[PDB]
Design a protein around this ligand. Structure first.
Ligand SMILES: CCCN(c1nc(-c2nc(N)cc(N)n2)cs1)c1cc(-c2ccc(S(=O)(=O)N3CCN(C)CC3)c(OC)c2)ccc1C
Ligand SMILES: CCCN(c1nc(-c2nc(N)cc(N)n2)cs1)c1cc(-c2ccc(S(=O)(=O)N3CCN(C)CC3)c(OC)c2)ccc1C
Ligand SMILES: O=c1ccn([C@@H]2O[C@H](COP(=O)(O)OP(=O)(O)O)[C@@H](O)[C@H]2O)c(=O)[nH]1
Ligand SMILES: O=c1ccn([C@@H]2O[C@H](COP(=O)(O)OP(=O)(O)O)[C@@H](O)[C@H]2O)c(=O)[nH]1
Ligand code: NA
Ligand code: NA
Lengths: 228, 228
C-alpha cells in the first residue's frame, strides 16, 4: 500500500528542492510535482501559463478559474502517480508537492480573503472541492511541513529569479505563513476533512540552506515514515 | 441494472413537462430534474440563482463559472439518483433532464462561440469535462430528443413567463436548435465520447401541445425502451 505524504510550506520554502532530493534517495520513493510549479517554467501547461499570467494581471477576474484548474490538475497528477507508480516497491512512499488541502485552505482561502473571489465563487469552489474530493484514495498518511520565515521565503523568491514573482510583497508571505502555522503547527485551522485533525505532521526548519547538507532532514523523514 | 435515458431539447421544448408526465406513469420510472431548471425557480440553489442572475448581467464574466457549476451540479444529482433510487424496480429507468453532453456540446460550446468564454476558459472547461466524466456510470442507454421549432420554443418561453427569459431572442433558439439537429438528427456533431455515435435516439415532434394528450408520445417511449 503506497504511503501518501504531502510536503507543505510557504512559497520558495524549498519544497521542490527537497522533493527532488527525496526522489533520488530510494527506488521506493516517488514525487508528484505541483502543477502550478510546472506552469511557472502540453494543453494543461498552455492553459496553466495563460491562467497564471492573467492571474498576475487581474486576480479578482481569474482566481476562481485558476484555483479550480490548479486543484483539478493536482488531483489528476496525484491519481496518475498513485495508479501508475511504485507497483514493485517494498516500502512505497509517494511525496506530494502540496495537497488539495493547501489549494483550498492556503491559496483559495487567501484569495477569498483578498476579495479576489466573491462569496458565490468561494462557496462554488468549496462545494466543488468538497464534492471533487469526497468521491478518496488521495487521503494523506502524513504531512511534512517545511517551515521557513517569511523573510527566508522572500530571499528564496529572489534566489529563484522568476520575473513575475519579484513583486510578491513580504505581507503576502506573512499571511500565507500565518495560515501554515494555524494549520500545521497550532492545528487551530478547522477543515472539512475530519481525518486531517489526527494526521501525523513532521515540522522541519529549513531556514538554513540544505541543498548540500540535507542528511539530518532526510534522517527525520525516515524516522517519521517508520512511525506511520 | 438502471437504464439511463437523457431527455434533450431546446429551451422550453417541454422537457420538464414531459419528464413530470413520465415519472407519474411507473414506479420503475424516476427522473433527475436539471439543476439549472431548479435554479430558475439550499447552498447549491443559492449559488445557482446568484450565478444565473450574474450570467444575465455579464455572460463574458460568468460563463466558465456557470457552466462548471451547472455540470458539477448535474453529475452530483445524476450519481445521487443512480445510487439512491430504483433499488426494488423490475425494469428500472432513470430519465435525465438533459445530460453532461448538452452542457458541453450545446450550452458551453455556444457560449465559447459567442466569445462569452475565451479560448483558455473553453479549453480548461473541456479538459475539466473530459476528466470529470472519464473517471463513468452515467453513460446513456438512449436519448429522447424532444424536437420543437425555434418559434414553438419562443412561444413556450412566453407561456412559462420567467421574467429573465422574455428577452431571449429567436436567433439564440435557432442557434441551439441547429446544434441539437447536428447532434441528435444528422449525428454530424463530433464529440469526445465514442459510444454516443451509436447510442439509440428517439426523436419526438412536440410542436403540438401534449400536456393533456401525451399517450402517443409515451407509447413511442415504451417501444423505444423495449428495444434497448
Ligand atoms: C507565487 C504566488 C503566485 N500566486 C498564486 N498562487 C496561488 C496558488 N494556488 C494554488 N492552489 C497552488 C499554488 N501553488 N499557488 C494562488 S495565487 C499569485 C498571487 C498573486 C497575489 C499576490 C499577493 C497579493 S497581496 O495580498 O499582496 N495584495 C493585496 C491586494 N492588493 C490590491 C494587491 C496586493 C495578491 O492580492 C490579490 C495576489 C497574484 C497572482 C498570482 C499568480
Ligand atoms: C434560458 C437561457 C439561459 N442561459 C443559459 N443557460 C445555459 C445553460 N447551460 C447549461 N449547461 C445548462 C442549461 N440548462 N442552460 C447557458 S447560457 C443564458 C443565456 C444567455 C444568452 C442568451 C442569448 C445570447 S445571444 O447569442 O442572443 N447574444 C449574442 C451576443 N450579443 C451581444 C447578445 C445576444 C447570449 O449571448 C452571449 C447569452 C444569457 C444568460 C443566461 C443565463
Ligand atoms: O536550501 C535551499 C532551499 C532552496 N533554495 C533556493 O530557494 C529557491 C526556492 O526553492 P524551491 O523552488 O524548492 O521552493 P518551493 O517554492 O518549491 O518551496 C530556489 O531558487 C532554490 O534553489 C536554496 O538555495 N537553498
Ligand atoms: O405541450 C406543452 C409543453 C409545454 N408547455 C408549456 O411550455 C413551457 C415550457 O415547457 P417546459 O418548462 O417543460 O420546457 P423545458 O424548458 O423544460 O424544455 C411551460 O410553460 C409549459 O407548461 C405547454 O403548454 N404544452
Ligand atoms: Na525514487
Ligand atoms: Na415513477
Amino acid at each position: 500500500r503506497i504511503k501518501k505524504i504531502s510536503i507543505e510550506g510557504n512559497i520558495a520554502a524549498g519544497k521542490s528542492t527537497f522533493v527532488n532530493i527525496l526522489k533520488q534517495l530510494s527506488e521506493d520513493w516517488e514525487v508528484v510535482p505541483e502543477p502550478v510549479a510546472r506552469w511557472s517554467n502540453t494543453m494543461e501547461q498552455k492553459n496553466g501559463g495563460n491562467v497564471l499570467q492573467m492571474m498576475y494581471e487581474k486576480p479578482e477576474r481569474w482566481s476562481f478559474t485558476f484555483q479550480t484548474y490548479a486543484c483539478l490538475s493536482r488531483i489528476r497528477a496525484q491519481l496518475a502517480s498513485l495508479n501508475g507508480k511504485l507497483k514493485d516497491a517494498e516500502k512505497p512512499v509517494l511525496f506530494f508537492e502540496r495537497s488539495v488541502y493547501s489549494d483550498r485552505y492556503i491559496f483559495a482561502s487567501n484569495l477569498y480573503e483578498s476579495e479576489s473571489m466573491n462569496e458565490t465563487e468561494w462557496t462554488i469552489y468549496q462545494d466543488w472541492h468538497d464534492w471533487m474530493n469526497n468521491q478518496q484514495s488521495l487521503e494523506l498518511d502524513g504531512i511534512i511541513y517545511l517551515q521557513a520565515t517569511p523573510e527566508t521565503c522572500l530571499h528564496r523568491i529572489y534566489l529563484r529569479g522568476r520575473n513575475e514573482e519579484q513583486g510578491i510583497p513580504l505581507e503576502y508571505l506573512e499571511k500565507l505563513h500565518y495560515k501554515h502555522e494555524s494549520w500545521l503547527l497550532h492545528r487551530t485551522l478547522k477543515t472539512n476533512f475530519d481525518y486531517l485533525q489526527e494526521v501525523p505532521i513532521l515540522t522541519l526548519d529549513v531556514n538554513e540552506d540544505f541543498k548540500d547538507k540535507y542528511e539530518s532532514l532526510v534522517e527525520k523523514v525516515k524516522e517519521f515514515l517508520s512511525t506511520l
